């Protein structure tokens, strides 16, 4: 399940329920090392309204992806768990976590004064707007 309730302004009002499984691959023939990747898409005001963004993730793969509804740090940082049988014979899980911060966006205009028929260039430095690492991300103007 994915979405928000009411305004979605309060943290208690945003929700994202999902489980992700990593099918890691052995590096060599006799190398006990198993390799995988993770990637996440931070939600923005545009993709949150589209069911495409939530159905777009791959929940089970060697390279899964998952949704982040808000900044996840400290106790809420995403963590991967691996149940393990130790050399002492007792089952003891091993885990790692990494924080998924959000970024403050800035918008700028290249010049302080323009003249008629001057090119005006707009740039937005928000890291959270990158939703795919393979493709160029594009935002377009609405005509309705």
């Amino acid at each position: 399940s994915f979405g928000f309730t009411d305004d979605g302004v309060q943290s208690s009002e945003r929700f994202a329920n999902q489980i992700i499984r990593i099918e890691a691959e052995e590096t060599g023939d006799n190398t006990s090392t198993f390799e995988g990747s993770l990637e996440y898409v931070m939600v923005n005001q545009i993709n949150i309204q589209d069911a495409g963004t939530f159905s777009g993730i791959t929940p089970i793969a060697d390279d899964p992806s998952f949704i982040v509804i808000e900044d996840l740090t400290d106790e809420d940082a995403p963590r991967v768990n691996y149940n393990d049988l130790g050399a002492d014979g007792v089952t003891t899980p091993v885990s790692d976590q990494e924080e998924a911060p959000s970024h403050s966006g800035v918008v700028s205009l290249n010049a302080d004064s323009y003249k008629i028929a001057d090119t005006v260039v707009i740039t937005v430095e928000d890291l959270d707007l990158n939703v795919d690492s393979d493709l160029i991300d594009i935002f377009t103007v609405v005509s309705d």
Binding site: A87, D88, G89, V90
Partner: protein
């Protein structure tokens, strides 16, 4: 459960001799008492309540009931290294042996925490530097925070 060498590293085949028991090579103790699972015919004591020590441990989710149940073995590091290593994990609860002079052992009726008790290992050398039987050991303390 029918032999004096129960829950110890050695052999089920055994004999009673002057120096001690012939089938015993190594064992582990909490508070100078053999760490053994509550099994056999002498494990019917319930203690304060009406629950026997064996089911008392099971309700706490403990499977490491004694040294024999951890799968502890002594394994030589190499083919001819002469160094043997084993390992296991300290449990939260254990069941004390009331009387060691009976076979099987008689177990208490109530589980006890391992915290604040010393842990020891005892090795019996059938052949020391002169070719005589001697027992040697090491100790350590279990703590809590």
């Amino acid at each position: 459960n029918s032999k004096a060498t129960d829950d110890a590293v050695g052999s089920a085949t055994t004999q009673s001799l002057s120096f001690g028991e012939l089938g015993r090579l190594l064992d582990v103790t909490f508070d100078d008492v053999i760490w053994s699972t509550p099994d056999g015919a002498n494990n019917t004591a319930t203690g304060n309540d009406s629950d026997t020590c064996s089911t008392e441990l099971s309700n706490a989710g403990i499977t490491d009931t004694g040294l024999g149940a951890t799968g502890f073995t002594l394994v030589e590091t190499g083919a001819a290294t002469g160094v043997f290593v084993g390992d296991f994990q300290i449990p939260s609860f254990w069941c004390r042996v009331s009387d060691t002079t009976t076979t099987p052992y008689t177990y208490a009726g109530d589980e006890e925490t391992t915290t604040g008790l010393d842990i020891e290992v005892n090795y019996v050398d059938f052949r020391d530097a002169s070719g005589e039987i001697v027992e040697v050991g090491d100790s350590a303390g279990v703590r809590a925070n």
